[PDB]
Design a protein around this ligand. Structure first.
Ligand SMILES: CNC(=O)[C@H](Cc1ccccc1)NC(=O)[C@H](CC(C)C)[C@H](CSc1cccs1)C(=O)NO
Ligand SMILES: [Zn+2]
Length: 411
């Protein structure tokens, strides 16, 4: 049992990171506001780690990470020394404790955002928008689209994915597409059925780019750079024909002729079918052409797009809650799952449940409502906050127009 190790390792890392950042949001906001923390507990069970801060805060860690808390100085929960009252939770104005309670979920969302922004820089793999077929008597039929072609830029905006293609087609007709062999063309032009286009697997030359070790292709003599010119005496021209011959012949020997180093090499390969379905042949090769696009982002935009993705996630959670009442493998997927679980936690722990942060939010909101000893004061902040807004959004609005100058008739 070795997969168990990495699995529970990722589980513990995810849970620890989420709980630790929630409690650290609570702790750091309370500390910056002037509230002294008494205990910083992460996980349930018996303490496996324990250390006292210079401010008497006891950070403790237990081995079952399913929750945690941050206990502050509070007269409602115990005796407070006369010299510690100015650092007590309850001795602060109501808005301070409101922000302290709100800090947790916010923290979660914040983490989500940054994690999303972290995976938008590393590069995300999407599927190439490869038009496999064209329909008759459609808008694309008169325009004569290419059989097997890849979209490059529709109506000006450069797209590298299918979802991006449909989002551009609903954003707004010029279509720059790349067919096999010949160069890009701006064709004089599901949802694509309105136009007469169909998507599918990418096609190309029967050239080899990868050959797995100890595979039937490697044992038969296939090498990288080989271009299969014929299978069983029949000449082929597309990678799809090659994979057709491979799948249709599980265990039967195929006699290939490949173009290699300027000459022609004859080979023999016996593709073997896998365990899940011993009806589809397989020998272990990859096409020399790519079928993946790599979406990259600048981090100054990756942050905003991760925020938008978190908003999409929380609206999805809202839809799911109202109803209730591509593959980019690697660690990059683990980080996405971690951020999604973080969003789930930041949503669920904000529900007006008595012992959760939402219940505390409700309690301090009704306490603020009951406590109205001054007028025209609540309005005062109402401007002093907005000022900051109309200042900070100004600063960026300045900096934005500053960064466009730093960039800037050849033909
Ligand atoms: C997966 N665990 C949770 O989501 C629970 C609540 C819960 C349990 C079961 C079902 C649904 C929700 N949340 C928390 O433990 C919060 C910290 C999490 C967000 C890291 C915690 C809520 S209070 C307390 C929990 C235990 C003792 S005191 C908090 O706000 N600290 O600042
Ligand atoms: Zn909390």
């Amino acid at each position: 049992m070795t997969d168990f190790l990495y699995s529970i390792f990722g589980l513990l890392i995810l849970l620890g990171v989420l709980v630790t950042f929630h409690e650290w949001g609570h702790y750091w906001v309370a500390k910056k506001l002037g509230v002294k923390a008494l205990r910083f507990s992460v996980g349930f069970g018996k303490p496996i780690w324990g250390r006292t801060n210079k401010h008497g805060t006891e950070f403790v860690i237990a081995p079952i990470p399913l929750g945690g808390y941050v206990r502050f100085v509070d007269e409602r929960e115990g005796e407070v020394a006369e010299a510690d009252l100015p650092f007590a939770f309850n001795r602060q104005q109501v808005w301070k404790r409101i922000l302290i309670v709100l800090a947790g979920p916010m923290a979660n969302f914040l983490l989500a955002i940054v994690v999303y922004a972290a995976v938008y820089m590393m590069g995300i793999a999407v599927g190439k928008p490869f038009v496999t077929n064209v329909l008759p008597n459609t808008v694309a039929a008169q325009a004569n689209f290419p059989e097997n072609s890849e979209i490059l830029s529709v109506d000006g905006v450069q797209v590298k994915s299918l979802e991006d293609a449909i989002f551009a087609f609903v954003d707004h007709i010029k279509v720059v597409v790349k067919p096999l062999n010949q160069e890009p063309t701006t064709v004089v032009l599901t949802i694509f059925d309105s136009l007469g286009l169909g998507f599918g697997r990418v096609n190309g030359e029967p050239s080899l780019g990868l050959v797995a070790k100890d595979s039937p292709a490697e044992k038969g003599g296939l090498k990288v750079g080989d271009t299969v010119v014929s299978v069983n005496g029949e000449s082929i021209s597309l990678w799809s024909e090659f994979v057709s011959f491979i799948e249709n012949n599980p265990g039967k020997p195929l006699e290939l002729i490949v173009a290699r180093d300027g000459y022609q090499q004859p080979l023999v390969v016996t593709p073997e079918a896998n365990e899940r379905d011993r009806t589809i042949g397989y020998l272990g090769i990859s096409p020399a052409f790519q079928g993946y696009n790599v979406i990259n982002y600048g981090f100054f935009e990756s942050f905003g797009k991760g925020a938008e993705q978190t908003w999409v996630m929380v609206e999805r959670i809202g839809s799911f809650l109202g109803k209730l009442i591509t593959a980019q493998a690697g660690m990059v997927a683990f980080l996405l799952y971690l951020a999604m679980i973080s969003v789930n936690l930041g949503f669920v722990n904000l529900l007006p449940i008595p012992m959760l942060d939402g219940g505390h939010l409700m309690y301090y909101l009704v306490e603020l409502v009951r406590g109205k000893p001054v007028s025209e004061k609540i309005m005062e902040l109402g401007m002093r906050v907005g000022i900051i807004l109309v200042l900070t959004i100004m600063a960026i609005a300045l900096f934005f127009d500053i960064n466009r100058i730093n960039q800037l008739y050849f033909q």
